[PDB]
Amino acid sequence: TLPIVLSCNYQSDITYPGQKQFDCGNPVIDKFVRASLKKSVRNSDCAAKALIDRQSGELIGICTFTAYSLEKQRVSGVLQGSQPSEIGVVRLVMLGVARKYQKRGFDQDLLCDFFEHVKIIHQALPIKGVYLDADPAAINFYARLGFVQLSATPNAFGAVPMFLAIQHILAALEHHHHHH
Amino acid sequence: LPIVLSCNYQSDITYPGQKQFDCGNPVIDKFVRASLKKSVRNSDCAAKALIDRQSGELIGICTFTAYSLEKQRVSGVLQGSQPSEIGVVRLVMLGVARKYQKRGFDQDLLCDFFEHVKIIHQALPIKGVYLDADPAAINFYARLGFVQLSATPNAFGAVPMFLAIQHILAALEHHHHHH
């Protein structure tokens, strides 16, 4: 029973079917994948996780992330205990699922594949968690999978800051892995 | 004189003499004595270490963390179009015990750190390595490719320095294989 979708680290020299258009419902994310995805990871501005259909090769979802650091003030109330003045985290800057695959759980399949990559990152370089700026159409999604909202004020766009500590990401990962 | 073991500092291992660890820099000393062991358990940083293999004694320390800078600070050094917030790996502390100094162990640790930075870069792309260089170590880091961003050492008397990932990967690739 071969898997139907595959998780891949996106290669800048590869163009999947649907990548040149990739209608996902977020116009900002849409224009990024169509025109700017190849050059961002070539510069190593970010890393990308892709969801490819094994049969057709179509780009089901994308997920880009960078390294980032936050002051302890923006997280106080979430990171408990004594914490340093600067908090190193992995920032999730984009995660979109193509519209013709939405409402099917591929939203979360990409997040768990991203969580597994965060675990890899954590073993080479310690981080406190994952930070993101959630569009209002996606606050409930990240909140439904552990992320706690830090403020109700959107910065530069409707996006709001959300955070998920590394302890909860690891506990979610080994759960999934201990089951089967 | 000793067989050196390239180590990732683990907080469960007890290191003989770690509670004394004279290295010249007193700020870096007292961090190794009390804070570093708790620092990596709480995962406030990672630390690469060299261990005297015949005695288990800590020879050198090298702490680093995930960090980020603004495009302002690496202007004129990083070429091309760069995003708003830059992602780097920050070298926090690097000290060698005085008993082992003058033998080039500090450059050996920095090479292990660069080898680890390459591994980090293959999982989380970074733009280079940032650090605030003490004036005593400025000639040491500048000799290794690092460049001095500003001449203002307002942090604690240390000036900020940076070295792009392009040059680390090239420097680590500069060692051959005749197989």
> Which chain B residue is nearest to residue A68, measuring alpha carbons?
B68
In A, minimum Cα distance to B90 occurs at A88
Taken as a whole, chain A contains a residue count of 180
Confirm if B132 and B159 have CB atoms less than 8 A apart: yes
- Residues 6+ positions from A35 with CB-CB distance below 8 Å: none
Bridge-based pairing of strands A59-71 and A47-53 is antiparallel
Helices B105-121 & A106-124 angle (0-180, nearest 10)? 170
Q: What is the CA radius of gyration of chain A?
A: 16
- Taking residue B34's Cβ as centre, other Cβ atoms within 10 Å add up to 11
For CA atoms B73, B76, B82, B87, give the dihedral sign: negative
Number of domains, chain B: 1
- What φ, ψ does residue A130 adopt, rounded to 5°? -125, 130
E strand segments, chain B = 4-8, 46-52, 58-70, 85-96, 128-133, 147-148, 159-164
The token pair that represents A93 in the structure block: 């800057």
Residue from B85, B126, B127 nearest A156 by CA: B85
Token readout for B8 is: 């990732």
Task: Write the DSSP symbol of residue A21.
Answer: T
Give the one of A47, A84, A117 whose C-beta lies nearest to B44's C-beta: A84
CB interface of A with B, residues 92-131, below 8 Å: 117, 120-122, 124-128
Number of neighbours of residue A125 by Cβ within 10 angstroms: 26
Q: Take residue B37 and report the two structure tokens written for it.
A: 């062991």
CA neighbor of B45 nearest in space, from B53, B37, B33: B37
Q: Is B76 on the interface with A (CB under 8 A)?
A: no
φ/ψ (deg, to 5) at B167: -80, -30
> By residue range, what is the domain housing residue B128?
1-179
Solved with: X-ray
| Interruption sites in chain A after residues (C→N beyond 2.5 Å) | none
For A63, the 3-state DSSP assignment is strand
Quick one: which of A87, A90, A68, A86 has its CA closest to A169?
A: A90
DSSP B73: T
Q: What is the resolution of this structure in A?
A: 2.8
